[PDB]
Amino acid sequence: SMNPPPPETSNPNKPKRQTNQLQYLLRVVLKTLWKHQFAWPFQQPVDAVKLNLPDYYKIIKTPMDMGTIKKRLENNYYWNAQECIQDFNTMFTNCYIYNKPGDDIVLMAEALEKLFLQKINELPTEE
Ligand SMILES: Cc1cc(-c2cc(NS(C)(=O)=O)ccc2Oc2ccccc2)n2cc[nH]c(=O)c12
**Atom number in ligand 1 closest to CA 53:** 25
Alpha carbons 18 and 61: distance in angstroms, whole number: 28
- Is residue 95 in contact with ligand 1, taking CB distance under 6 Å? yes
Alpha carbons 51 and 57: distance in angstroms, whole number: 12
Identify the structural domains of the chain with CATH numbers, from first to last: 19-123 (1.20.920.10)
CA distances from 98 to 22, 29, 38, 92 (A): 29, 25, 18, 10
Is residue 70 within 8 A of residue 26, CB to CB? The reply is yes
Please, which residues have CB within 8 angstroms of residue 111's CB and are 6 or more apart in sequence? 36, 38
Experimental structure resolution, Å: 2.4
15 Rama class: left (phi>0) / alpha (psi -120 to 50) / beta: beta
- Is residue 98 in contact with ligand 1, taking CB distance under 6 Å? yes
**Atom number in ligand 1 closest to CA 46:** 12
Residue closest to 93 by CA, chosen among 121, 58, 61: 61
